[model samples]
Target: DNRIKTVVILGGGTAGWMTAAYLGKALQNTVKIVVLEAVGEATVPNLQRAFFDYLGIPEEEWMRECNASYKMAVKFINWRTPGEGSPDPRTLDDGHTDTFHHPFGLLPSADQIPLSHYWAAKRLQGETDENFDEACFADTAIMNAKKAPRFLDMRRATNYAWHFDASKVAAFLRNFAVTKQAVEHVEDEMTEVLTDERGFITALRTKSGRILQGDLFVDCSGFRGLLINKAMEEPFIDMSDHLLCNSAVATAVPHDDEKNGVEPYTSSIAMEAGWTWKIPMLGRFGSGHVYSDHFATQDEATLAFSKLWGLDPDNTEFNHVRFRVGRNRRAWVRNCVSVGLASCFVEPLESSGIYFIYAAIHMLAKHFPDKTFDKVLVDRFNREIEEMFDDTRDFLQAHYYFSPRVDTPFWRANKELKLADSIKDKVETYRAGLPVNLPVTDNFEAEFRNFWTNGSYYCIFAGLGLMPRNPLPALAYKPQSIAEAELLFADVKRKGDTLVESLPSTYDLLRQLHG
Candidate 1:
């Protein structure tokens, strides 16, 4: 009995189950893993298939139980500017309006030329089509709705994500984890947490008055941060100075709402106060209003939402998700490590909540704990996670700060909001035709390389009406300016279209995976 090691998890929502599944798979034979789920209706699941596939999980299995859908890319309508919001509402008037699509692919760039070169040429020639949708030539995924490309063709061509029912996803993962390993599903509610003299979490008391203890604890209690913040007293690092929208009202609708052409992307449209997100899952669509109370009343915002969809909303399950825009001061503090909502959250702007969890899990695996509790190793790991959170905050903030639209109070307010120094520095350097320096922080390697290679900085600089003082960094590589520009445009246009068209539609891929 002394050798029977025990592991107790406090919550059993998406984060809890995901942690259990991964840990169960990794350490099944030795440890006794127990997941204590609060006694309540199962919460919604938000697992994206693209991420699951990236983790080597078969999309078919996850989709079958989770009620999944193929998400192409997010269509950002009117986020660029306000009054014109979302391409002449007339297009959507006949319900066929133009919206910019930001796909999940890398920005286009030559082996030698920066990807921004294409946009620069377009801008220099007054090209409005350089917006993500047109330049990417989205007609291909629009065509094939289930055929996987050849095995080797996975990288450059296809880019996609997923939208699935949150609760179902948890159940699916739970089944998978339990069958593969050992998971004791506790049917009790946690009433309190007890800490030891060292300030580490020692035990959790359920309403049944039963006490459960473990050597370590993972906090997935959502906004409450029951263990990390409330019980452990960890400080919440607020990023509201840069990232706005402190509250979100989410409503789920049946799949029958606007049944035509299930788009392969999420719809992030600018609203009067902040923004609205429309995510299409297989059986239903998830919609939400992320806004600030400082600008508009809840009633005013809800009325606008009701009018836009042309219905009063059949089942409006509204939940107010309040959160700080950044991470915990230290993710791994003392003996307790926080994951998912317990760690930190920047909005769902880029569908990054799950991504943050994945990033943290990867970091954990890279630096699993030893009994000795190496402080240096733990500090380094914590620093790496912090950097990822900071990078995401800057990226989400860029969408707002670089906006040319000012139709609403939300957009107008961003004009006065102070930008993060890192983001501001990048914006300035790119405007001057200087290479944007990637900060030498963890996970900055690939992102930095891609920033320059993809000309992302250039996209924002030129997109927001900034101009370079001199030739771009890539200009030195080209010998014939006119001929090179023409040749490059043609090649990029041809190749970019070819790559996008070759991939199967998100729906088609889902169907095949299910079939």
Candidate 2:
């Protein structure tokens, strides 16, 4: 309700502060927003780099509290192709699952449709010389061994996000929210959630023996779902079937001590059991191995990770993080709303953790709460969130199920994992030479479309290892001869390279912002 007076945000992690910051800004001079941060362990720094780079949030005393890093696009290796069987040793051991990128900014040439259509059409016409790398960012990046520009905009060519210590991010958010007025930070743990007869959360009982009551309650208590799940009993929807990787071990390795400068991309290499992620932060590198225990135990995964990373575990053995792949049946219940890990979770393959939460916060503002508690409106909102999570699930699953690797038992098991109907259909459509219809409820629409059109799927088809039976035509282009086509593509690649060359480095962007 517009007249709604107080909103109590539970937990002071990135989700809480992000929620607080947006609520405090939008509601402005109205709505009392208070965040309850648990006594121990603050927010992480996954979003800090982007906050400075894109949003122009200046670094302050609070930011210094955490170690930060600049994260470019995620680098995926050996997902589409196996590492061992590659014909060339120089070709980066993992089968290059047509290395594509997920850049933070929009393309400069707004009118350039994805090249999947181009490749598919070429194949249908029986053209054998077409190279998928000619059109996609991943191929281009690998060829150049650098980061892709933000888009066509040279000045803004660096599309990016951050990788920071998670706890530090939470602390920064907590401090930021407190300074914004009418925002209280409760430094205590939540022991119980008080609810009414209708099963709506009325207040949170803190461990310090204080009753923090509010008209609206936000459940940010993570997997426990202190309010939404524990109190409201919103059924947990299992997304694990589509997204199977649920376990991860995170290690924070200081950057300066390391020999290499950070790349403008996160590194996600497909492994025997699951996949590993390498995220570079300001002064450190955060590495994690995500796998399914069903296929390999913790010991096996640890060994696999050490082998892939080429480092000793004693160097950065922090902690093992375990998670389930799913979401709350309802993101918003009667008077309670859930955010972050409490609401939903897909595998962290594409760094969907922060983005999903950010999108949900944006959605909440769009579908602001009403007093009537309209069931239709709420269900529609839930459906929107569900669609987003499900779409991500399908996309992450595609990283595996679409893989040509049948080399190991884990890869072998992936072949049998049941795919969501939407994903299965999307694969069929790609094979049939059609684009994945932009879903109305898609959260990461632009990026998804970009990847589908210009990224992996196109390369896989263009490489012609698994050709589409009937390729789709390129966007009704003017005809050109073989020599003409080659020359034109060569020119395009040149221009693309020149554009990337002109952009600032990820480090330059950070120094310019923070210096």
Candidate 3:
């Protein structure tokens, strides 16, 4: 008799419908889930492996409907002071200033230890300027070749996420959750929330005079935080100081629908105040500039933004957005759990938005409550969510701190910003010639205990020219293996080159999928 029978979700945005889909399917109508209102561009692999695949949706089933494109890696441009290459013949480039790829796949290892450690050992010896992405991860080559992720048999040759219209995705999720998953939806505004003497939400009063009662309430109301913040009064933990960029303006640009095709990855180029994103989808490019207003005015950012697209800044009608770069002080408050923007937002630099929603849903299921509303479960859930967001904050903070860019007011201010304790410790560790090793295993949940793994740190650290004084002892102690590691890296080049010659171009593959 203590089982919770119903749940009410406040917003039908990407977060709201996604929560509804997961709860509805898992509970199988045993619990009623209600979603009220809502509304990503890019994602991480978990969006596919954990969410859609688990939900029984095929790649093309959603991708084609949403004008989605493959994102094998994120290509970062001009985030650092350039690394001058060594004069050695073993070197890959004369100048280490090429755009680097932070890919989905791990560094390829031919030895017992990780490939990153081996790469670092040789790097310290001044033998080569290692192209970490190109030599270690095939994702870089696949992206460079503009090739589809699948091989001839449709088996994946590399890991990938997607670039899609966020609003379209919301609509798609709404249709699936309502028509198939049995999630109840209401098109009504929440004018008021009824609360018990203890401050737990009893029911939501809509403008239509309808009272929607539930045992649990979920706030997926984007930045509004309708239930959790407005009603429960859970104060926000603002992180604007750590991550400076809070304003963004989104617009579209033309693409060669049939000729050049779309790029197979996201291109994140650094601007004066912040970064501008170019996400390709079908015949259009979804472009946006995310910056802080403290450094750049609306016109200044947009002028830089529109100039990037070769358009007149005054003529372009861009969708302006404001974000509070932080998470809730407590994601789960009393009977209410906040998901998505209501819970946290860490500046989508690595496209963590959709992935975060999936995490919230997954963790919510793990910490599901009965009518008793267990306090321990809520505390544990909130702690984990806190770590997830904090880790993301630290991960993103590294992007700015390590960047040698101080030419602009924004970059200069960010360069001097106070470091989060975790990242400061990690940077010192890297400076002392050790990798930031967190637990990673075959179990997806266990592997993603931290949003960014050592592999991720390797990509960022190596790309930013922040290497240890020496390699990890395992790689440094054995000097003979360095030659073997060199050959192993070369072998990847061969394999990648071979795949580049064979795999279909992303355009052809999209055509095949859609046709």
Candidate 4:
């Protein structure tokens, strides 16, 4: 009948459980799904809001279960060039100097063009001192003002994601899959993978000598790629040349006071060798320093991270992680599909770990295969998965490649590193004032495409003092005068202030939700 029946998933963490939950919800009773997870595994999950909405998970439930917190934007510090007489004193410092926001939702535009265009036009007209962060309405009005939109309405000028305990999220998903969706959960460590003579996965033999067989196999075994790599031997394509950071040391820190309140954003502070990520959850801040071992040692990065966060370097427990930056040539090989770290990993710089899992599950659900395992369907799935990885790599690369920092070897090396063809093409297109074209066939690509838009490109380019010298005449069309533009911006600020006043503080909201 060419109908697939049982699906077996290897390695349980965020990836495995998320896949199980999605498949259980989608194919319930029609097909049996089982997740084989090794005990004592952990994860760091940063989920986009749409994933929750699509899964029909209540925000309240997620927050409580996962020790979650709202993430309205990713605040980038020390990525921009320091300007003399800058409005903010922090910009005058040498390190962790300037601040910018890659805010969620729309940028304030004028005369039917993106706000970036107006800012660029102003900069070209000798207003060289106009700060991109302050000029952009989303940055100045919402994120910088420490405000979040009350609802999930994109039209209201704020959208949000979530930062949560990844391990807890996996447990939560496991419960949902097992209890609500009737998906079987198996706790076992797979020791051997049995493949047929034709080179397709036949079954998995666990430590207890139990054999589990299924119509399809999904590998979520992290970097080990237990099935996808060990059994299938899929070739990996390394992106270390483009993505420099290869290791990270992470730990949690407690919030000190109300003055240093929980921000509804993830702060990515630039460091000498790499960067430090500060994700504020309800209970504490999840902090980490990600760096390249080629450039800096673990001890150096850990010390720098401690200094940045004001923690004792000798005392803090740092969870060191080493990872390769790339993806397999094919995520789907034969009857096996690799998800999460088994398929690809760029870095945690963009909170892309769990997002990739969500994307993989979404793609699988969309093009679910039958027992025959149609080549066309498999090829399409692989192509889409590769594109998603390539796009994500380019986006992460752009952050480092476009920086003006040269104080350290890490920054200097990044500056000289050759850009990827896709990123180079996008940079050229943006320089020419043309819209960066990206696929929008599905919700996953749509979110990835958002990073390719002109507004996002402007944040990276213009924010780093790389504003295009010559503008596209068509894009530069400004129907309003500078005075009119300023007035409109003022009105936007006023509306933003009103919205901020209307919404509860991040602390109060968390209290209300939890209490």
* Candidate 4 Cα misplacement greater than 4 A, ranges: 39-50, 81-97, 108-111, 151-157, 257-259, 438-445, 448-451, 475-487
What clash pairs does model 3 have? 12-37, 12-38, 13-38, 13-39, 14-39
Q: Give each prediction's root-mean-square deviation over alpha carbons.
A: 5.2, 5.2, 3.7, 4.0
What C-alpha lDDT does candidate 4 achieve relative to the native structure? 0.75
Candidate 4 local Cα displacement, residue 365, angstroms: 1.2
The lDDT values for all models are: 0.63, 0.62, 0.81, 0.75
Superior by lDDT: candidate 3 or candidate 4 = 3
Best by lDDT: 3
Local error of candidate 1 at residue 149 (angstroms): 8.6
Where in model 2 is the C-alpha error above 4 Å?
39-72, 81-114, 122-134, 147-154, 256-259, 438-467, 473-488, 499-504, 508-514
Q: Worst lDDT window (10 residues) for model 4?
A: 39-48
| 1-515 per-residue lDDT for model 4 (tens digits) | 77888899998878999999888877857999989987011122224344666668976786688777777667677765532111232553434347776655556545555667667766777765656666665435666555544533323346667778888898898998899887888887888899888998888998999999888999999998988888898988888888899999899887752665567778777887888787877668888878999999988887777877678988888899998789999999999999999999976776777778877888898879998889999999899888888888888889988887777788888877788888888888877765565223224455643545666677667666667656547654545545566776677667777776666566666665667
User: In model 3, which runs have C-alpha deviations exceeding 4 angstroms?
Assistant: 38-40, 81-98
Residue 136, model 3, lDDT: 81
User: Residue 505 error for model 3, in Å?
Assistant: 0.6
Residue 421 lDDT, candidate 3, scale 0-100: 89
| Per-prediction TM-score | 0.83, 0.82, 0.94, 0.91
lDDT of 1 by residue, 94-188 (tens): 23343555444444344444445544555555654454344533322342232232113234244455676667778887776677566888888
Output the better candidate (2/3) by lDDT.
3
Give per-residue CA lDDT, model 2, range 1-515, as digits (tens): 34667788887777888788767766775778878876011112334442332234664444445555445455456566554322111242333334544443222221243344554566567664444554534334422444433432324444345556666676676666687445788889888888888877778888889998787787777877878887888888876667667787656555652344446556666776787776665556677778888877888888777766566866646568788698887899998888889999866676778776766776676676755667876787788788778777777777777677787777877778898898777778777666555322212334333333334444433432445667554444435433344454565567666766665555544444444
Q: How accurate is candidate 3 locally (lDDT)?
A: 0.81
How many residue pairs in model 2 have overlapping backbones?
21
